[PDB]
């Protein structure tokens, strides 16, 4: 990635990013996981907080994951870029031409209610009051060298909060503040949830590197209504209200 950047590591316990010179642009997953444990004993000097980075360890039980995954695998997996394969329960959108098509959007997966309810329980303010606009499951495999390029998700139809859930196996999220020249690594463990919002959503860029992917990982990705497409917004009548109605619909996957 970027050699000149200052590398940081995330302490889940302290909810801060701690500066590390033992970690680098090409650092291995194992090194980042060990630093995640060894950053918990370091001073707060030079430490930074990325607002909107919320990592919940153990969001889903083995039992809860088993039900969601069996429903996911029965559904077909589509081709995608960068070694990824995808299942998209969302509208078809041309971000450049601001066009939304609801032809392929039938609703949201039946497991959605459980995930949304649990997010509200942990924090109603932080993860509650979420209306699903897109729920996309992404397949990453070490053999296929799957990865996602450093990026900021579109902010026109997708809202402040972006949710990624690590299924089957965990990974590391690399976050880049190009202007501030800061690189941070967030280790998302198995059955964990990440919400990227606020500074993380707009100021920082998010990507999953190939060397940080082991075995097969499925990202259950969720997106929320942009305020413009929501009630009290310009596009609600043209596009948002239908999208809320379709998102309220649940596709039966059990079966
Ligand atoms: Cl799979
Ligand atoms: Cl992503
Ligand atoms: Mn993204």
Numbering used by the authors: 34 to 288
The authors write:
Here, we showed three complex structures of 6mA demethylase C. elegans NMAD-1A, a canonical isoform of NMAD-1 (F09F7.7). NMAD-1, one of the AlkB family members in C. elegans, demethylates the DNA damage modification such as 6mA and 3mC. C. elegans NMAD-1A protein has 291 residues involving an N-terminal extension (NTE), a nucleotide-recognition lid (NRL), a DSBH domain, and the CTD. Like other AlkB family proteins, NMAD-1A requires the binding of the cosubstrate α-KG and ferrous iron for catalysis.
Here, we show three C. elegans canonical isoform NMAD-1A crystal structures with different ligands, including Mn2+/α-KG, Mn2+, or SO42−. These structures present a conventional and conserved double-stranded β-helix (DSBH) consistent with multiple unique structural features of a stretch-out Flip2 motif and a functionally indispensable carboxy-terminal domain (CTD). Finally, we chose to engineer NMAD-1A with site-directed mutagenesis to increase the binding ability of NMAD-1A to nucleic acids, thus making protein crystallization easier. We then expressed and purified these NMAD-1A mutants involving three mutations (E109K, Q112K, Q114K) separately or jointly from the Flip1 region and determined their binding ability to different short nucleotides using FPLC. Next, we collected the peaks of the protein and nucleotide complex for crystallization. In addition, the main chains of Asp-186, Met-188, and Ile-190 in the structures containing the CTD further moved into the active center 2.3 Å, 2.7 Å, and 4.1 Å, respectively. In addition, SAXS analysis showed that NMAD-1A existed mainly in the form of monomer in solution. Hence, four copies of NMAD-1A found in each asymmetric unit were due to the crystal packing. Moreover, the positions of the L3 are the same between the determined three NMAD-1A structures and are probably fixed by forming interactions with the DSBH domain.
